[PDB]
Amino acid sequence: EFIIRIPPYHYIHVLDQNSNVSRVEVGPKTYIRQDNERVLFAPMRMVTVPPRHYCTVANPVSRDAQGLVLFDVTGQVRLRHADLEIRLAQDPFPLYPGEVLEKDITPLQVVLPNTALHLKALLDFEDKDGDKVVAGDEWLFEGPGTYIPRKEVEVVEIIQATIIRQNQALRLRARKECWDRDGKERVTGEEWLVTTVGAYLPAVFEEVLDLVDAVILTEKTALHLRARRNFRDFRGVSRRTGEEW
Amino acid sequence: EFIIRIPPYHYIHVLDQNSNVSRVEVGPKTYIRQDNERVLFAPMRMVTVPPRHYCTVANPVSRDAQGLVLFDVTGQVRLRHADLEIRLAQDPFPLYPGEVLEKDITPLQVVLPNTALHLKALLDFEDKDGDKVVAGDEWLFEGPGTYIPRKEVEVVEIIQATIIRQNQALRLRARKECWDRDGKERVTGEEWLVT
Amino acid sequence: EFIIRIPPYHYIHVLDQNSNVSRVEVGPKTYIRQDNERVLFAPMRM
């Protein structure tokens, strides 16, 4: 049919069979379909991202410096095949040909306070402050704030901070060679204790094991302790392996 | 039908099929529908907000500095899609095309004395006194007064004050790093007593 | 019907029911008849 009335906030795609090319007919205006064109689908409401939401569209249109949608001379539109893009709140937009709504209008994820996100850089990229990120690097998005999703970064899980109370310590095992918040070199399998009172947030490599409670030494008791490796106790005594005290 | 009598305090929407555009025909006057127009619905009574109430309308019309309802040249009306707005008591108003009555005429919530509201800022905004609010910040609307709802602020629950009598103290656990009313630094899990 | 193809050397008359007025649509060109117009007769050779 030639007469194609397109309601406000809707769009259609007419296929010029001359070049078998499709173009997005978007606008609150009716359309005349000629012999050479063939509308692909009825007017579809343009997808709007409500504020505080986001959406990602498969094969985003290969726009330019001004954001003008680069259109192929043949009658198609230049697309970044197989890539993704994050589109935040804006006016309703038409799906140009060769684009798929990969991610719907989903809410921006806001982490609660004393909680963190275990992000990981799937694709090599450069972060906000010129950071030479590489594929595989892990990230901790802590804070009660909101995280704006990104193509090169994937959230793996949400970790929760561990509250270390008074007279308590938390067992931390290095999952890989790393440094402790006190800047102490750690090796894979090395376990240590963090006594800082508060909601201690576990790091990407530091693995929370358990909370160790102190033992209260009255005047009628004392503690019988045998070492397991060479070290120095709090008094500084250089105890040896197997030594009991 | 061409003859469309619109009773006082009612409105209709005629669709100019020429541009498939709808316009709000509001007024205590009859209307003539031509071949190009097509009324969408019979006269609907304009929604009035009774005093001390409020209402929120989906996709509020993108008004201007003077409040003139910016109308699209095509025959539509400029809308702030997907947003909300709080409309208090006023004269009955017509629903311009592309607007949905999100919140009816509900009463303004007045907290009783010695009670408070647990508000939280869903959307980043700036408060009354230029406060750099961020998304997620919590608010306590206490007082026997009345709270005027807002788009960027959501009430989470109504908390009730705890009466501490003589020779008594109340256990207070910090849910997060914070300061006590006596300006005492607190850490998550820290419990103290208020006398 | 909106689509009104007028062959070369032919003409039609569309009645704008708004004013019940008719105008000669002459030309080797197709025509779009809106809701307000109503073609009176098919293209007639001039």
Side-chain angles (χ1 to χ4, degrees):
Chain A
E1 304 179 1
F2 281 60
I3 172 70
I4 312 283
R5 294 186 178 93
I6 312 172
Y9 303 119
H10 287 65
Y11 59 70
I12 80 182
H13 284 236
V14 297
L15 175 88
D16 188 3
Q17 318 194 40
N18 289 337
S19 303
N20 285 359
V21 285
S22 309
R23 314 188 61 179
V24 63
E25 310 303 301
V26 53
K29 313 168 184 179
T30 176
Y31 188 64
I32 296 86
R33 146 193 166 268
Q34 290 65 9
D35 295 0
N36 59 2
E37 299 168 359
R38 183 187 63 87
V39 175
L40 298 155
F41 54 81
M44 291 325 188
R45 296 190 57 87
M46 293 183 284
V47 175
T48 173
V49 180
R52 97 183 164 90
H53 293 60
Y54 76 91
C55 82
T56 86
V57 175
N59 313 304
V61 280
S62 172
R63 293 188 171 93
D64 51 47
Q66 310 88 6
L68 329 168
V69 194
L70 287 185
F71 213 80
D72 191 6
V73 175
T74 323
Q76 293 288 9
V77 61
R78 308 191 54 58
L79 295 157
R80 297 156 282 183
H81 298 253
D83 308 3
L84 266 300
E85 274 318 314
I86 317 294
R87 270 178 262 282
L88 301 179
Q90 52 186 346
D91 306 0
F93 45 79
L95 281 183
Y96 295 67
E99 276 196 341
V100 173
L101 190 63
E102 178 74 14
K103 247 294 182 182
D104 308 359
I105 42 165
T106 54
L108 228 61
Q109 58 178 180
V110 63
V111 175
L112 299 92
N114 289 358
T115 316
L117 295 175
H118 183 230
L119 324 172
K120 174 177 49 189
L122 294 190
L123 266 43
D124 188 339
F125 78 102
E126 165 261 1
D127 204 14
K128 314 177 181 181
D129 295 6
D131 179 296
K132 175 59 212 173
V133 200
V134 201
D137 287 8
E138 301 287 0
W139 300 77
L140 265 202
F141 185 67
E142 63 185 342
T146 319
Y147 171 69
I148 48 184
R150 195 165 181 174
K151 203 183 81 83
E152 40 267 14
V153 178
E154 168 202 3
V155 74
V156 180
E157 203 182 4
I158 322 184
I159 76 168
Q160 303 178 0
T162 304
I163 294 169
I164 308 177
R165 318 183 66 179
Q166 183 73 4
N167 295 0
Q168 278 186 359
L170 178 71
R171 303 175 47 183
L172 282 193
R173 177 165 48 183
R175 286 175 288 238
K176 71 172 189 57
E177 197 293 299
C178 58
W179 261 249
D180 178 56
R181 308 202 160 167
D182 217 300
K184 182 61 182 179
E185 192 272 357
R186 307 298 187 179
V187 295
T188 308
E190 170 166 357
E191 301 185 1
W192 61 99
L193 294 187
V194 175
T195 68
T196 67
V197 177
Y200 180 67
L201 180 80
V204 278
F205 52 97
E206 301 172 358
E207 172 193 0
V208 163
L209 304 181
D210 199 1
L211 265 179
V212 174
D213 43 359
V215 185
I216 326 292
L217 316 171
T218 79
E219 200 78 31
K220 297 173 49 185
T221 51
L223 199 52
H224 185 197
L225 295 171
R226 159 157 42 86
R228 300 179 172 178
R229 317 146 199 88
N230 295 2
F231 75 102
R232 302 177 67 92
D233 58 345
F234 56 94
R235 295 176 64 186
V237 185
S238 204
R239 267 96 188 236
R240 273 145 291 193
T241 306
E243 167 178 358
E244 303 179 359
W245 62 83
Chain B
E1 304 179 1
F2 281 60
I3 172 70
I4 312 283
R5 294 186 178 93
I6 312 172
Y9 303 119
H10 287 65
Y11 59 70
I12 80 182
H13 284 236
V14 297
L15 175 88
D16 188 3
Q17 318 194 40
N18 289 337
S19 303
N20 285 359
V21 285
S22 309
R23 314 188 61 179
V24 63
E25 310 303 301
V26 53
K29 313 168 184 179
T30 176
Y31 188 64
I32 296 86
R33 146 193 166 268
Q34 290 65 9
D35 295 0
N36 59 2
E37 299 168 359
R38 183 187 63 87
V39 175
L40 298 155
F41 54 81
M44 291 325 188
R45 296 190 57 87
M46 293 183 284
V47 175
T48 173
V49 180
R52 97 183 164 90
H53 293 60
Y54 76 91
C55 82
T56 86
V57 175
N59 313 304
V61 280
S62 172
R63 293 188 171 93
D64 51 47
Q66 310 88 6
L68 329 168
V69 194
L70 287 185
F71 213 80
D72 191 6
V73 175
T74 323
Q76 293 288 9
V77 61
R78 308 191 54 58
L79 295 157
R80 297 156 282 183
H81 298 253
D83 308 3
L84 266 299
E85 274 318 314
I86 317 294
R87 270 178 262 282
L88 301 179
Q90 52 186 346
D91 306 1
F93 45 79
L95 281 183
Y96 295 67
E99 276 196 341
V100 173
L101 190 63
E102 178 74 14
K103 247 294 182 182
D104 308 359
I105 42 165
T106 54
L108 228 61
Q109 58 178 180
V110 63
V111 175
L112 299 92
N114 289 358
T115 316
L117 295 175
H118 183 230
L119 324 172
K120 174 177 49 189
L122 294 190
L123 266 43
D124 188 339
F125 78 102
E126 165 261 1
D127 204 14
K128 314 177 181 181
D129 295 6
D131 179 296
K132 175 59 212 173
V133 200
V134 201
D137 287 8
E138 301 287 0
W139 300 77
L140 265 202
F141 185 67
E142 63 185 342
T146 319
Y147 171 69
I148 48 184
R150 195 165 181 174
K151 203 183 81 83
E152 40 267 14
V153 178
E154 168 202 3
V155 74
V156 180
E157 203 182 4
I158 322 184
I159 76 168
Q160 303 178 0
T162 304
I163 294 169
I164 308 177
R165 318 183 66 179
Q166 183 73 4
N167 295 0
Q168 278 186 359
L170 178 71
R171 303 175 47 183
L172 282 193
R173 177 165 48 183
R175 286 175 288 238
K176 71 172 189 57
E177 197 293 299
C178 58
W179 261 249
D180 178 56
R181 308 202 160 167
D182 217 300
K184 182 61 182 179
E185 192 272 357
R186 307 298 187 179
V187 295
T188 308
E190 170 166 357
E191 301 185 1
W192 61 99
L193 294 187
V194 175
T195 68
Chain C
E1 304 179 1
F2 281 60
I3 172 70
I4 312 283
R5 294 186 178 93
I6 312 172
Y9 303 119
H10 287 65
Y11 59 70
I12 80 182
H13 284 236
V14 297
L15 175 88
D16 188 3
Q17 318 194 40
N18 289 337
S19 303
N20 285 359
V21 285
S22 309
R23 314 188 61 179
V24 63
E25 310 303 301
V26 53
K29 313 168 184 179
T30 176
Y31 188 64
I32 296 86
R33 145 193 166 268
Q34 290 65 9
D35 295 0
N36 58 2
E37 299 168 359
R38 183 187 63 87
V39 175
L40 298 155
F41 54 81
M44 291 325 188
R45 296 190 57 87
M46 293 183 284

PDB file of all heavy atoms in Angstrom, chain C residues 30-43:
ATOM      1  N   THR C  30       0.252  11.800 -10.777  1.00  0.00           N
ATOM      2  CA  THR C  30      -0.697  11.152  -9.833  1.00  0.00           C
ATOM      3  C   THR C  30      -1.116  12.175  -8.774  1.00  0.00           C
ATOM      4  O   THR C  30      -0.407  13.188  -8.616  1.00  0.00           O
ATOM      5  CB  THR C  30      -0.076   9.910  -9.184  1.00  0.00           C
ATOM      6  OG1 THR C  30      -1.015   9.422  -8.225  1.00  0.00           O
ATOM      7  CG2 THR C  30       1.246  10.193  -8.509  1.00  0.00           C
ATOM      8  N   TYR C  31      -2.222  11.916  -8.073  1.00  0.00           N
ATOM      9  CA  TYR C  31      -2.726  12.883  -7.066  1.00  0.00           C
ATOM     10  C   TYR C  31      -3.026  12.161  -5.750  1.00  0.00           C
ATOM     11  O   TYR C  31      -3.333  10.957  -5.791  1.00  0.00           O
ATOM     12  CB  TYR C  31      -3.979  13.587  -7.582  1.00  0.00           C
ATOM     13  CG  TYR C  31      -4.449  14.730  -6.716  1.00  0.00           C
ATOM     14  CD1 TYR C  31      -3.662  15.856  -6.536  1.00  0.00           C
ATOM     15  CD2 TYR C  31      -5.664  14.679  -6.059  1.00  0.00           C
ATOM     16  CE1 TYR C  31      -4.077  16.909  -5.739  1.00  0.00           C
ATOM     17  CE2 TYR C  31      -6.091  15.722  -5.253  1.00  0.00           C
ATOM     18  CZ  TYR C  31      -5.296  16.842  -5.096  1.00  0.00           C
ATOM     19  OH  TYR C  31      -5.712  17.879  -4.302  1.00  0.00           O
ATOM     20  N   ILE C  32      -2.930  12.873  -4.623  1.00  0.00           N
ATOM     21  CA  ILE C  32      -3.276  12.274  -3.300  1.00  0.00           C
ATOM     22  C   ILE C  32      -4.563  12.940  -2.807  1.00  0.00           C
ATOM     23  O   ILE C  32      -4.544  14.166  -2.584  1.00  0.00           O
ATOM     24  CB  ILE C  32      -2.120  12.444  -2.293  1.00  0.00           C
ATOM     25  CG1 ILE C  32      -0.862  11.691  -2.727  1.00  0.00           C
ATOM     26  CG2 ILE C  32      -2.565  12.037  -0.895  1.00  0.00           C
ATOM     27  CD1 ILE C  32       0.037  12.469  -3.662  1.00  0.00           C
ATOM     28  N   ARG C  33      -5.616  12.162  -2.661  1.00  0.00           N
ATOM     29  CA  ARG C  33      -6.860  12.703  -2.200  1.00  0.00           C
ATOM     30  C   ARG C  33      -6.952  12.579  -0.697  1.00  0.00           C
ATOM     31  O   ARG C  33      -6.997  11.470  -0.163  1.00  0.00           O
ATOM     32  CB  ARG C  33      -8.026  11.952  -2.843  1.00  0.00           C
ATOM     33  CG  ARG C  33      -9.234  11.804  -1.936  1.00  0.00           C
ATOM     34  CD  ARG C  33     -10.224  10.801  -2.497  1.00  0.00           C
ATOM     35  NE  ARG C  33     -11.213  10.408  -1.499  1.00  0.00           N
ATOM     36  CZ  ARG C  33     -11.083   9.358  -0.696  1.00  0.00           C
ATOM     37  NH1 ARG C  33     -10.006   8.592  -0.780  1.00  0.00           N
ATOM     38  NH2 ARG C  33     -12.030   9.071   0.186  1.00  0.00           N
ATOM     39  N   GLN C  34      -7.024  13.715  -0.010  1.00  0.00           N
ATOM     40  CA  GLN C  34      -7.123  13.727   1.449  1.00  0.00           C
ATOM     41  C   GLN C  34      -8.556  13.495   1.940  1.00  0.00           C
ATOM     42  O   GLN C  34      -9.478  13.316   1.147  1.00  0.00           O
ATOM     43  CB  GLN C  34      -6.578  15.039   2.016  1.00  0.00           C
ATOM     44  CG  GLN C  34      -5.072  15.201   1.887  1.00  0.00           C
ATOM     45  CD  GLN C  34      -4.614  15.292   0.444  1.00  0.00           C
ATOM     46  OE1 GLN C  34      -5.428  15.406  -0.472  1.00  0.00           O
ATOM     47  NE2 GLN C  34      -3.303  15.247   0.236  1.00  0.00           N
ATOM     48  N   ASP C  35      -8.739  13.511   3.254  1.00  0.00           N
ATOM     49  CA  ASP C  35     -10.058  13.294   3.835  1.00  0.00           C
ATOM     50  C   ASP C  35     -11.049  14.382   3.428  1.00  0.00           C
ATOM     51  O   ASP C  35     -12.217  14.098   3.150  1.00  0.00           O
ATOM     52  CB  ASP C  35      -9.966  13.213   5.361  1.00  0.00           C
ATOM     53  CG  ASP C  35      -9.184  12.004   5.833  1.00  0.00           C
ATOM     54  OD1 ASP C  35      -8.714  11.225   4.977  1.00  0.00           O
ATOM     55  OD2 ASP C  35      -9.036  11.832   7.061  1.00  0.00           O
ATOM     56  N   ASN C  36     -10.579  15.623   3.391  1.00  0.00           N
ATOM     57  CA  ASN C  36     -11.425  16.757   3.034  1.00  0.00           C
ATOM     58  C   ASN C  36     -11.824  16.824   1.559  1.00  0.00           C
ATOM     59  O   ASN C  36     -12.881  17.357   1.223  1.00  0.00           O
ATOM     60  CB  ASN C  36     -10.757  18.070   3.453  1.00  0.00           C
ATOM     61  CG  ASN C  36      -9.397  18.261   2.815  1.00  0.00           C
ATOM     62  OD1 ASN C  36      -8.949  17.433   2.020  1.00  0.00           O
ATOM     63  ND2 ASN C  36      -8.731  19.357   3.157  1.00  0.00           N
ATOM     64  N   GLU C  37     -10.983  16.285   0.681  1.00  0.00           N
ATOM     65  CA  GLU C  37     -11.275  16.316  -0.776  1.00  0.00           C
ATOM     66  C   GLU C  37     -12.042  15.054  -1.172  1.00  0.00           C
ATOM     67  O   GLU C  37     -11.963  14.059  -0.432  1.00  0.00           O
ATOM     68  CB  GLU C  37      -9.971  16.420  -1.569  1.00  0.00           C
ATOM     69  CG  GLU C  37      -9.180  17.673  -1.259  1.00  0.00           C
ATOM     70  CD  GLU C  37      -7.766  17.654  -1.813  1.00  0.00           C
ATOM     71  OE1 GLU C  37      -7.393  16.641  -2.434  1.00  0.00           O
ATOM     72  OE2 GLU C  37      -7.044  18.653  -1.627  1.00  0.00           O
ATOM     73  N   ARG C  38     -12.730  15.086  -2.307  1.00  0.00           N
ATOM     74  CA  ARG C  38     -13.473  13.940  -2.813  1.00  0.00           C
ATOM     75  C   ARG C  38     -13.460  14.077  -4.324  1.00  0.00           C
ATOM     76  O   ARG C  38     -14.103  14.974  -4.869  1.00  0.00           O
ATOM     77  CB  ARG C  38     -14.909  13.953  -2.292  1.00  0.00           C
ATOM     78  CG  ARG C  38     -15.732  12.749  -2.718  1.00  0.00           C
ATOM     79  CD  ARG C  38     -17.190  12.904  -2.313  1.00  0.00           C
ATOM     80  NE  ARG C  38     -17.823  14.038  -2.980  1.00  0.00           N
ATOM     81  CZ  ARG C  38     -18.391  13.975  -4.181  1.00  0.00           C
ATOM     82  NH1 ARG C  38     -18.403  12.831  -4.851  1.00  0.00           N
ATOM     83  NH2 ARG C  38     -18.943  15.056  -4.714  1.00  0.00           N
ATOM     84  N   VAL C  39     -12.736  13.201  -5.017  1.00  0.00           N
ATOM     85  CA  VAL C  39     -12.662  13.347  -6.465  1.00  0.00           C
ATOM     86  C   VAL C  39     -14.040  13.131  -7.069  1.00  0.00           C
ATOM     87  O   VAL C  39     -14.759  12.193  -6.697  1.00  0.00           O
ATOM     88  CB  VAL C  39     -11.626  12.373  -7.043  1.00  0.00           C
ATOM     89  CG1 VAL C  39     -11.626  12.427  -8.561  1.00  0.00           C
ATOM     90  CG2 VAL C  39     -10.251  12.673  -6.500  1.00  0.00           C
ATOM     91  N   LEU C  40     -14.424  14.006  -8.004  1.00  0.00           N
ATOM     92  CA  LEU C  40     -15.730  13.857  -8.640  1.00  0.00           C
ATOM     93  C   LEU C  40     -15.696  12.821  -9.758  1.00  0.00           C
ATOM     94  O   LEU C  40     -16.586  11.968  -9.837  1.00  0.00           O
ATOM     95  CB  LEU C  40     -16.236  15.198  -9.158  1.00  0.00           C
ATOM     96  CG  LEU C  40     -16.461  16.293  -8.114  1.00  0.00           C
ATOM     97  CD1 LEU C  40     -16.356  17.668  -8.727  1.00  0.00           C
ATOM     98  CD2 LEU C  40     -17.823  16.110  -7.473  1.00  0.00           C
ATOM     99  N   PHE C  41     -14.691  12.874 -10.628  1.00  0.00           N
ATOM    100  CA  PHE C  41     -14.657  11.920 -11.728  1.00  0.00           C
ATOM    101  C   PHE C  41     -13.219  11.545 -12.059  1.00  0.00           C
ATOM    102  O   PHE C  41     -12.277  12.286 -11.772  1.00  0.00           O
ATOM    103  CB  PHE C  41     -15.391  12.459 -12.970  1.00  0.00           C
ATOM    104  CG  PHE C  41     -14.919  13.812 -13.436  1.00  0.00           C
ATOM    105  CD1 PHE C  41     -13.778  13.945 -14.203  1.00  0.00           C
ATOM    106  CD2 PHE C  41     -15.637  14.952 -13.123  1.00  0.00           C
ATOM    107  CE1 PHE C  41     -13.353  15.186 -14.631  1.00  0.00           C
ATOM    108  CE2 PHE C  41     -15.211  16.193 -13.554  1.00  0.00           C
ATOM    109  CZ  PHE C  41     -14.067  16.306 -14.310  1.00  0.00           C
ATOM    110  N   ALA C  42     -13.081  10.375 -12.690  1.00  0.00           N
ATOM    111  CA  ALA C  42     -11.790   9.850 -13.092  1.00  0.00           C
ATOM    112  C   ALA C  42     -11.145  10.775 -14.127  1.00  0.00           C
ATOM    113  O   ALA C  42     -11.816  11.646 -14.691  1.00  0.00           O
ATOM    114  CB  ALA C  42     -11.962   8.440 -13.661  1.00  0.00           C
ATOM    115  N   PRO C  43      -9.837  10.627 -14.379  1.00  0.00           N
ATOM    116  CA  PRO C  43      -9.173  11.503 -15.354  1.00  0.00           C
ATOM    117  C   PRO C  43      -9.826  11.504 -16.728  1.00  0.00           C
ATOM    118  O   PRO C  43      -9.973  10.452 -17.356  1.00  0.00           O
ATOM    119  CB  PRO C  43      -7.748  10.945 -15.409  1.00  0.00           C
ATOM    120  CG  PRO C  43      -7.542  10.351 -14.078  1.00  0.00           C
ATOM    121  CD  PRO C  43      -8.868   9.777 -13.665  1.00  0.00           C
TER     122      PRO C  43
END
